[PDB]
Amino acid sequence: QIKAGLIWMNGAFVPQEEAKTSVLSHALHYGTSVFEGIRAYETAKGPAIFRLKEHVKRFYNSAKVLRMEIPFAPEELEEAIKEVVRRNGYRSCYIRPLAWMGAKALGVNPLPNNPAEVMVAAWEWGAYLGEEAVRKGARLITSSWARFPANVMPGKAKVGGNYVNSALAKMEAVAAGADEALLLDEEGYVAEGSGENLFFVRDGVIYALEHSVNLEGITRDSVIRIAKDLGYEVQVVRATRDQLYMADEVFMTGTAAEVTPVSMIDWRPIGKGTAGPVALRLREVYLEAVTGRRPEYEGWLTYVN
Amino acid sequence: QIKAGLIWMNGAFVPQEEAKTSVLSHALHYGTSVFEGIRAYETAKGPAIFRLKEHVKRFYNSAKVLRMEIPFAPEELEEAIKEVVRRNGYRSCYIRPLAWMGAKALGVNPLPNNPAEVMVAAWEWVRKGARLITSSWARFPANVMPGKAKVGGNYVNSALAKMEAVAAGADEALLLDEEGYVAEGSGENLFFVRDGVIYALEHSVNLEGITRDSVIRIAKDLGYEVQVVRATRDQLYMADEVFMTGTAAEVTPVSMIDWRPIGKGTAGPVALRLREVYLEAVTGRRPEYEGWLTYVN
Amino acid sequence: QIKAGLIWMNGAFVPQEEAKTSVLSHALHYGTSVFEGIRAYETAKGPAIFRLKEHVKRFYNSAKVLRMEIPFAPEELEEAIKEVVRRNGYRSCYIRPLAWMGAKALGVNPLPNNPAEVMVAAWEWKGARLITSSWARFPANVMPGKAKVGGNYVNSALAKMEAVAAGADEALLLDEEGYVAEGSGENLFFVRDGVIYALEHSVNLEGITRDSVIRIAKDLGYEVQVVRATRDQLYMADEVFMTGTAAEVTPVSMIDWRPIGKGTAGPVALRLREVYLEAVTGRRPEYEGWLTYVN
Ligand SMILES: *Cc1c(COP(=O)(O)O)cnc(C)c1O
Ligand SMILES: *Cc1c(COP(=O)(O)O)cnc(C)c1O
Ligand SMILES: *Cc1c(COP(=O)(O)O)cnc(C)c1O
Ligand SMILES: [Cl-]
Ligand SMILES: [Cl-]
Ligand SMILES: [Cl-]
């Protein structure tokens, strides 16, 4: 499977083969888990975790939505997140904290299963997209699956069950020949990708999409701050698929996707048909920030060493 | 059970006992009435009615939505509201102006019943925070009921929600709109605070609160950044603070929603400061906000 | 019929009489066409087309929504538009560019019909009373509301007919959720306590007149906010007005038989309208950039 190595399991690191849970775990049956996507980027000062506290804060916030009790102080989880990097001797890596309801009972109500089991795993990237691919840009296709209304699934939380919607949309997009899916909300407005927030640029202005039913991305937040620091005007608005069709540029953000320009949506080219200068510039500054080359953004980094 | 005393009835004051209307009144059958909630607070210079002008304007605006004709000039209603306070010797009181379609006919169309009958009555009138529960009743879409007006019929929705919330052990209900976003309480506008920024909910299908308006101005004067946004229930769950505003509720901190504590689980500093400046304003202790007060004496 | 005169038909001008297309044209059966509305106003320096490039850009943008191919460069279309005014001797006129899918086939899919055929035609050019329509403007995933696609106007046509039959001048469409959207072909604004409120784009077309009015309003010193609005927010507004190439800035004095403010055209709407007219007729140096002098 995934080459994670030593995994933190409820308080102590164990070999990957020991990082297993009962197949009767509530979360494996009812999607009652919460997770985070965190990255450590190598610097000449060792690995630096990007916006660790903001991600951990969201982790506990997601748990609160499910009334899930995480039996560890945020400080303990933060230490575990730094340790999973050190103990495995990783430089750059992806970190996946997970809290899930165990196998105490299988009634749909997860309360009797509290407190939640928790683990932190991390693994290295197999490959990265090169500048050629980034410039060609991602191709999106609008999904036939709508992102869930705000009173159907908790869209501000990274709750496991939520991703059945993301999985269905992603599979559909790939089957259609696209790189990613663009989900609309039930009313017909653009929501977000299967796991990425959307932005578009028109006549010099950068438009971030309102939160609506989307997750409040930390990369999105980072990109907006960076854009403003560079002197760009940033507006937050609700958008339709055809506002994106006629945008000068479109790009998406996410911990895994960083800043990814989108060159085509529903087989309709965006602007020049390749990544545009704004998205390529934002991506560069963002990468400079996460890899510790921007003193003004060092506050966002937590050095493991 | 209400100790209203002298009530202004279509032009003249009469004892509470005499303030009655036909049970064939259109409004008692079809909810065709409009009302307001106005408060008078005691100050060093006597009772002061808070934002009288704004409330009366909305009273007439609500009537317009129903194509209801109020047979009095706003100035006359304003005098009656001041008199209801004076004549009853009130200082701190709740004032309830009410215009309703009468008993001329009972066809559902209220036009034949114009002009409306009008009456004005009044009666003498935290850190733990209020507990809310999200309702199973959604606030009406903007093309179903006039959500910007205080129309009587609208409150069947509020009544159902409030009843459900209290039965569930909460202090107030939090209504969502039909699309699933947060709307407002049964009779209060909502706000939340996150990372130092105050978020006032967009008007959407909610009533444009005068207390909400007041709080925003106060917040800005204090130096807080205020953003007007649409919000989901979980954005509130993760807020540092959340509070409600309304004439009766003033500025009320909300410490818990759906049994999920908000922030520290007790009233937060921001909501408390806004409430304090608001109470200072309505009691005549803020010169910069004196324009909002109408002194009875 | 319309007194268009010489019409540009896929590259060359021909008498109106010859400006015809097969009744088997895809667009005549399935609404697969795109168009624009552009005006030329007389100025001291001759006819001037208002914001020509922005309109042409939207024309091509509308085509992209339908994956329609326009076999001419924007520059060529812009020249044709200027020429339709010159050749016909027009001073103040309405210009109607149109790109439509032809008669190559009649399967609903329009791709086999590309490239589109194109034509450019032109003709010399109290407060409105509105009634809220029983037809909702289409959701953003039902019809492309940011594009001037022919088929979209069946919705506008139905709303307009209803409004007129009800005794009003124009229709006010709500979106499916119940919020105000726009008129059959005009963007909406309202004024309350000195502030001008432009409606968010939601499912509406991004009007060029709306854009011009917002800039003018800001330049005059007005505070402008962009919001979502309900019908009763309009009922209680001090003023309500709508914008569009044909409607310019039109004040709205009544909605659903409920008077707006004074019940007559208000000062803000009337002023924006007058300043807009001054801009399009070349009397405001600050807005000269928006004009294209034909001569
Ligand atoms: C994780 C996630 C994102 C991206 O948020 P980041 O904090 O930028 O990683 C966006 N949308 C969804 C649905 C997500 O789960
Ligand atoms: C009266 C009312 C409010 C609060 O408005 P205030 O002007 O602040 O008193 C909020 N929501 C509803 C539904 C109301 O009826
Ligand atoms: C053309 C149109 C408008 C007006 O836009 P302008 O660019 O100002 O002419 C508004 N709504 C619709 C549906 C339209 O087709
Ligand atoms: Cl397609
Ligand atoms: Cl619960
Ligand atoms: Cl009516």
Q: What residue type is B235 in one-letter code? A: Q
Dist CA A132 CA B37 (whole Å): 65
Which residue carries 């709205």 as its tokens?
C252
Kindly report the protein residue whose alpha carbon is nearest to atom 15 of ligand 1.
A195
Whether residue A145 contacts residue A182, with contact meaning beta carbons closer than 8 Å, is answered with no
Dist. CA A38–CA A34, nearest whole Å: 13
What's the CA gap between C19 and C11, in Å, rounded?
A: 12
Rounded to an integer, what distance in angstroms lies between the CA atom of residue A224 and that of residue A207? Answer: 9
Of B237, B219, B198, which is closest to residue B275 (Cα–Cα)?
A: B219
**Which alpha helices (DSSP H) does chain C contain, by range?**
26-30, 52-65, 74-88, 153-165, 208-220, 231-235, 267-280
Alpha helix (H) ranges present in chain B? 26-30, 52-65, 74-87, 155-167, 210-221, 233-237, 269-282
How far apart CA A146 and CA A25 sit, in angstroms, is 29
Task: Tell me the structure's resolution in angstroms, rounded to a single decimal.
Answer: 1.5
Residue B227 — φ and ψ, nearest 5°?
-120, 140
CB of A247 closer than 8 Å to CB of A202: yes
CB-ligand 3 contact for C186 (6 Å cutoff): yes
The experimental technique behind this entry is X-ray
Q: What percentage of chain C's residues is helix, strand, coil (to nearest 5)?
A: 30, 30, 40
- DSSP string computed for B192-212: EEETTEEEEEP-TTS---HHH
Q: Is B75 exposed, middle or buried (0-12, 13-18, 19+ CB in 10 A)?
A: exposed
CA triple B275-B279-B282, angle to 5 deg:
135
* Beta-carbon separation of B260 and A151 below 8 A: no
**Ligand 2 atom with the shortest distance to the CA of B188:** 10
* B-contacting chains (≥3 CB pairs under 8 Å): A, C
Q: What residues of C act catalytically?
A: 148
Q: Which amino acid is at A160?
A: G
Amino acid at C7: I
Q: The tokens 């009007």 sit on which residue? A: C207
Contact B98, B106 (CB under 8 A): no
CA dihedral C81, C83, C86, C88 (to 10 degrees): -80
Q: Pick from C58, C61, C142: which is nearest to A188 by CB?
A: C142
Question: For chain B, first and last CA: distance in Å?
Answer: 28
Both tokens of residue B124?
């003498």
Under an 8 A CB cutoff, do C177 and B203 touch? no
- Residue B228 CB burial class (10 angstroms; 0-12, 13-18, ≥19): middle
Asked if the Cβ–Cβ distance from C179 to B142 is below 8 Å, we say: yes
* Chain B contact probe: residue of A51, A62, A109, A156 with most B CBs at under 10 A: A156
Task: Assign 3-class secondary structure to chain C.
Answer: CCCCCCEEECCEEECHHHCCCCCCCHHHHHCCEEECCEEEEEECCEEEEECHHHHHHHHHHHHHHCCCCCCCCHHHHHHHHHHHHHHHCCCCEEEEEEEECCCCCCCCCCHHHCCCEEEEEEEECCCEEEEECCCCECCCCCCCCCCCEHHHHHHHHHHHHHHHHCCCCEEEEEECCCCEEEECCCEEEEEECCEEEEECCCCCCCCHHHHHHHHHHHHHCCCEEEECCCHHHHHCCCEEEEEECCCEEEEEEEECCEECCCCCCCHHHHHHHHHHHHHHCCCCHHHHHHEEECC
What are the tokens at A84?
């999973």
Which residues does ligand 2 sit against, CB inside 6 Å? B 37, 150, 184, 187-189, 207, 209-212, 245-247
Crossing angle for the helix pair A52-66 and A218-229, to the nearest 10 degrees? 140
3-class secondary structure, B295: strand
Helix (H) or strand (E) holding A282: helix A277-290
CB A36 within 8 Å of CB A27? no
Task: Just list the catalytic residues of B.
Answer: 150
Which whole-number Å values give the CA distances from A255 to A36, A50, B33, in the listed order? Answer: 10, 9, 54
User: Reduced to 3 states, what is the DSSP secondary structure of residue A41?
Assistant: strand
Query: Smallest Cα–Cα separation from B256: which of B180, B140, B174?
Result: B174
Q: Cα separation of B47 and B86, whole Å?
A: 9
Residues of A contacting chain B (CB within 8 angstroms): 61, 64-65, 67, 149-152, 154-157, 186-187, 210-213, 216
Three-state DSSP at A91 gives coil
Say yes or no for a CB contact (<8 Å) between A154 and B230.
no
Quickly count: other Cβ atoms within 10 Å of residue C166's Cβ.
Answer: 16
Give the β-pairing of A205-209 and A233-237.
parallel
Q: Please indicate whether, in this complex, the C-beta atoms of C201 and A243 are within 8 angstroms of each other.
A: yes
Structure tokens at A206: 């950068």
Q: Is the peptide bond before A149 cis (omega within 30 degrees of 0)?
A: no
CB B84 within 8 A of CB B129: no
Q: Which residue has the tokens 């907006």?
A: A224
Measured CA to CA in angstroms, residue C136 lies from A184, B143, C210 at distances of: 19, 11, 21
Cβ partners under 8 Å of residue C234, min gap 6: C172, C180, C188, C190, C240, C255, C260
Cα–Cα distance between B220 and B240 in angstroms, integer?
18
Beta strands B226-229 and B197-201 are parallel
CA–CA distance, C191 with C269 (Å, rounded to integer): 9
Q: How many CB pairs under 8 A join A and C?
A: 51
Contacts of C202 in chain A (CB under 8 A): 238
Spell out the domains of chain A, with CATH numbers in brackets.
4-130 (3.30.470.10), 131-293 (3.20.10.10)
Residue showing tokens 């009138």: B125
Pairing of strands C93-100, B250-257: unpaired
CA distance linking residue C198 with residue C215, whole number of Å: 11
CA dihedral A200, A202, A205, A207 (to 10 degrees): -30
Q: Which chains touch C (3 or more CB pairs under 8 A)?
A: A, B
Which candidate, A244, A275, A242, A272, places its Cα nearest to that of A260?
A275
Total residues belonging to chain C: 295
Q: For residue A7, say whether it is annotated as part of any ligand binding site.
A: no
| Among A53, A82, A136, A158, the one annotated catalytic | A158
Three-state SS for B292? Answer: helix
Q: In degrees rounded to 5, what are phi and psi of residue B209?
A: -60, 140
Q: How far apart are CA A153 and CA A165, in angstroms?
A: 10
Q: Which residue has the tokens 């450590």?
A: A40
Cβ neighbours, 10 Å, residue A10: 16
